[PDB]
């Protein structure tokens, strides 16, 4: 059967012929209560203490208990299970190439990494997830070191020089849609470039980047106050009211595409894709494949980051203290196996339950290339040139950049839009809203005894009235 | 897109790696999440917690 | 009275998001339930349901 499946293209042998041969069998949950499974065919071998001699079925591979997102984790069995669950959550928020035809698509939010790499340390389940064709991360050189204190409490220290060379650089695509909706006989919204002589209800922003068809064109830099679609509605001097589509606040970008079509109702319909290049920045959330999420705490240049005797500076420095209570030994083994794979030229196998791969084998392999067997290296201080007394565990680890960028979350308010009903500030940074000074904040300020600060928050800074 | 090869999908500006399995409703890709119902036609006996029935059997 | 979240906008953030969303199951149980029994990793999920992939928080 294995020989016939080895030539699947030229025997027309497939999985269904295995099902027809009485070799494999579909077992469901009630039927699995009456079968006696062997984890491996090694269980079928007679033992000195024979556990069972009446096995009914055998597992094909136990690593098929994992799903799609847990099969990206290298060495999942060496990790604590909350970290496996966290990585299953955060591999869906990683940034890569989400689909091959991303240029045709007008998605509302899209994230595309500049240089996605396939992992050096893969599982064999990652071939059937097509992860080495649409990958979602970069193999960093990660030193797990205490350097300058800026990686403490889950943070990382990135290399500014690496980031300058395109390390984890990406683009954020945002698409805006607008249609000329015909609301009766009077309200006729039309894509016309607005002139102040005939249009009212503006946000007092320049319409000069718009073309004469009422839409902006690709290649134009845009800013948070600028106009990308000029729509004017005809009201029953100011006959027209400005209902122009504005860009999102504080979002620099360049118009990547403008698409003009007719919708199902026959109206004119447009979608504009704006492209913003996101360079990695302090506060951007980067994660490994072991639940070691964190934010970039600082960026040092190449001359500032510590270096090995070969002049290899890490791309990312993570804190040692992120490891012990987390118990992500799969991270350390992934760094070791990635060092071996990058020196050897292989792609390391990290399928969960594999006796052929163990830490001692990888250590001997790494020692065969003139490195210390446990992955440590003699790093030098980048500021003084002096050797660091400890030897730093450094190696290639697959980091992924998460969607949670700091510029998509930073918010501030002095004053602005208030709600219609209760005249309190608005909801969220998209509406220039305020933050909620909720009930537990009130309780904390009571326990502080700060009654005037409590009045300022709950009366003056929210909704004063007489 | 059924039965088309990868070249035929790329000529249609589609991705051959795109799995399918979703709908397009008003230009929005919608996935139907599978829902775990109780199995039908099977007698299930449970001890009701703090109820007038000590044991109940449903189908 | 209609159950919500049966149809969802397909996650297209990376390919792993797309595949995970296309292979997703849901227990129609209220997410405010303080009982842990439907949330537990039951023994019978072996090989059918991923033991690691689940949301954090209320679900």
């Amino acid at each position: 059967h294995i020989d016939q499946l080895k030539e699947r293209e030229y025997n027309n042998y497939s999985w269904q012929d295995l099902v027809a041969s009485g070799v494999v069998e579909y077992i469901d949950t009630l039927e699995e209560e009456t079968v006696m499974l062997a984890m491996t065919p090694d269980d079928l071998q007679e033992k000195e203490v024979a556990y069972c001699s009446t096995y009914t079925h055998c597992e094909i591979h136990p690593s098929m208990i994992l799903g799609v997102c847990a099969s990206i984790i290298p060495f999942p069995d060496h990790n604590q299970s909350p970290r496996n669950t966290y990585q299953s959550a955060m591999g869906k928020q990683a940034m890569g190439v989400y689909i091959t035809n991303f240029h045709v698509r007008m998605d509302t939010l899209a994230h595309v990494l500049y240089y996605p790499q396939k992992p050096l340390v893969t599982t064999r389940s990652m071939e059937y997830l097509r992860f080495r064709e649409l990958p979602a991360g970069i193999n960093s050189i990660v030193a797990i070191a205490s350097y300058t204190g800026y990686n403490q409490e889950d943070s990382v220290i990135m290399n500014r020089s690496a980031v300058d060379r395109g390390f984890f650089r990406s683009v954020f695509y945002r698409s805006y849609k607008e249609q000329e909706s015909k609301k009766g006989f009077d309200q006729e919204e039309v894509f016309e470039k607005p002139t102040r002589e005939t249009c009212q209800g503006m946000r007092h922003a320049i319409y000069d980047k718009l073309d004469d068809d009422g839409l902006i064109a690709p290649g134009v830099r845009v800013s948070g106050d600028d106009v990308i679609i000029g729509k004017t509605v005809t009201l029953p001097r100011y006959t027209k009211r400005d209902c122009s589509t504005f860009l999102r606040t504080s979002e620099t970008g360049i118009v990547d595409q403008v698409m003009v079509t007719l919708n199902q109702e026959g109206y004119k319909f447009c979608k504009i894709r704006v492209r913003s290049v996101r360079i990695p920045q302090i506060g951007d959330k980067f994660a490994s494949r072991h639940g070691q999420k964190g934010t970039c705490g600082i960026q040092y240049r190449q001359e500032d980051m510590p270096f090995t005797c070969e002049g290899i500076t890490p791309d990312i420095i993570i804190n040692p203290h992120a490891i012990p209570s987390r118990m992500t030994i799969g991270h350390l083994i992934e760094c070791l196996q990635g060092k071996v794979s990058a020196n050897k030229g292989e792609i390391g196998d990290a399928t969960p339950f594999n006796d052929a791969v163990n830490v001692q084998k990888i250590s001997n392999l790494l020692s065969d290339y003139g490195y210390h067997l446990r992955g440590n290296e003699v790093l030098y201080n980048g500021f003084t040139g002096r050797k660091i007394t400890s030897q730093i565990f450094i190696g290639p680890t697959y980091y992924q950049r998460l969607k949670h960028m700091v510029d998509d979350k930073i918010h501030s308010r002095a004053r602005g839009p208030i709600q219609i009903l209760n005249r309190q500030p608005m909801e969220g940074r998209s509406r220039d809203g305020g933050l909620r000074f909720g009930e537990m904040e009130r309780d904390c300020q009571i326990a502080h005894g700060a009654a005037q600060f409590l009045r300022e928050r709950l009366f003056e800074a929210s909704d004063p009235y007489q | 897109l059924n039965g088309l090869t990868d070249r035929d999908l790329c000529e249609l500006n589609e991705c051959p790696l795109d799995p399918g399995g979703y709908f397009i409703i008003n230009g929005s890709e919608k996935v139907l999440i599978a829902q775990e119902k109780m199995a039908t036609n099977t007698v299930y006996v449970f001890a009701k917690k703090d109820s007038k029935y000590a044991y109940t059997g449903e189908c | 009275q209609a159950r919500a979240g049966v149809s969802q906008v397909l996650n297209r953030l990376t390919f792993a998001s797309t595949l995970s969303h296309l292979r997703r199951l849901n227990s129609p149980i209220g997410r405010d339930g303080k009982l842990a029994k439907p949330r537990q990793l039951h023994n019978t999920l072996w090989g059918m349901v991923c033991p690691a992939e689940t949301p954090e928080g209320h679900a």
Binding site: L5, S14, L18, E127, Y128 | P19 | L19
Partner: peptide, 29 residues
């Protein structure tokens, strides 16, 4: 011929590759 243990990893990943060549990942939908 029984699959000897030195060939078993290759054999099980070949039959798994056959399963994922035919069925795929979104086959249930």
């Amino acid at each position: 011929d029984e699959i000897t243990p030195d060939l078993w990893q290759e054999a099980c990943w070949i039959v798994i590759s056959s399963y994922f060549d035919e069925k795929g990942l979104v086959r249930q939908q």
